[PDB]
Amino acid sequence: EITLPEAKDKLSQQILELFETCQQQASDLKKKELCRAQLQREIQLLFPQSRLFLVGSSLNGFGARSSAGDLCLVVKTEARHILTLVHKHFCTRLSGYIERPQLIRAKVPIVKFRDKVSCVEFALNVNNTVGIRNTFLLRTYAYLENRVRPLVLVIKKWASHHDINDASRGTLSSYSLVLMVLHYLQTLPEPILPSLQKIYPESFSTSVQLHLVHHAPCNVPPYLSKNESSLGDLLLGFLKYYATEFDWNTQMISVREAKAIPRPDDMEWRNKYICVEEPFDGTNTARAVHEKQKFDMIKDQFLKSWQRLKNKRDLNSVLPLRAA
């Protein structure tokens, strides 16, 4: 059902070329799913009722070929001990096909490992079920409009190049960037994206069971927007909007309501510079950005990239096309 929107300008043609040269291919997903099934079978030995779920770029439609696999383990402090036991089991019995399994401290503790057969790393979290939901909510947004997936990919590639795309380093997480892209598409004068949670609350409700969650996108009809902007024009609008137009200090990005919402007066949101509302739980996906240096770096980089793209309507100004 993939459809490529009409390209009038050179920048839009280049964005489509990047989308075609970096679009996650079916083979990559297959290697990831194969590993997920074997890992689930291996853990099921440790926890008979456990279920291993692939979440993130791999299944939300915004993946790239170099994109790593994200695993969510579901079981019927509990998460901490279970993750440590999984890491130990991974070292003791699975050393043959798992390379250098690594336990990394984070808000959501995960285990980083590499599949030797597929040459693909994996990040596994235990019981962070909200990720399963946002994966398929994001997947629905990804295929709702033809320009969503290419635009997300060029912005994701652009951010990673300028080293503003790492939550561990204090910059924007890929989830936050995606949400920032979706919000821009939602709040345009001609709306490109609606609010899936508002329009179809039944489909994305927290009550739906996890195994029933992945079914939300198939049952949702597509959206036709009146926007006539090209991919390059949309990229420039997004770069201009987050560089000069969006007020980080006074506003919070909410994809849940499909509109900018004033920051809550409570103490959790007050300190933070960048406010992005997770649709399922009321938390900040931009919580990693906590340093003024990192915050200033992101803002200056957004404006710099917007400037260079305006002067030269070429992707090379902000993103190098040397590798393709």
Author numbering: 146 to 221, 233 to 480
Authors' text:
Germline development defective 2 (GLD-2) is among the first reported cytoplasmic non-canonical PAPs that promotes the translation of germline-specific mRNAs by extending their short poly(A) tails in metazoan, such as Caenorhabditis elegans and Xenopus. GLD-2 proteins from different species have various lengths, but share a conserved nucleotidyltransferase (NTase) region composed of a catalytic domain and a central domain. Different from C. elegans GLD-2, mammalian GLD-2 is an intrinsically robust PAP with an extensively positively charged surface. Whereas C. elegans GLD-2 prefers adenosine-rich RNA substrates, mammalian GLD-2 can work on RNA oligos with various sequences.
We purified the NTase regions of human (hs), mouse (mm) and rat (rn)GLD-2s (residues 131–484 for all three, and for mmGLD-2 another truncated version containing residues 143–484 was used for crystallization). Additionally, the two constructs also contain mutations at catalytic sites (D279A for rnGLD-2131-484 and D213A/D279A double mutations for mmGLD-2143-484), as the yield of wild-type proteins was too low for crystallization experiments. Crystals of rnGLD-2131-484 and mmGLD-2143-484 both have two independent copies in the asymmetric unit. Superposition of the two rodent structures showed a root mean square deviation (rmsd) of 0.52 Å for 322 aligned Cα atoms. Compared to ceGLD-2, mammalian GLD-2s are featured by apparently shortened N- and C-termini, as well as the absence of a ceGLD-2-specific insert in the central domain. The N-terminal portion (residues 1−130), which is not conserved between mammalian GLD-2s and ceGLD-2, did not significantly influence the PAP activity of human GLD-2. These data indicate that, unlike ceGLD-2 which requires interaction partners to stimulate its PAP activity, mammalian GLD-2s are potent PAPs on their own. The fact that mammalian GLD-2s are intrinsically potent PAPs and stay in a constitutive active state suggests that they may not need GLD-3- or RNP-8-like partners as in C. elegans to stimulate PAP activity.
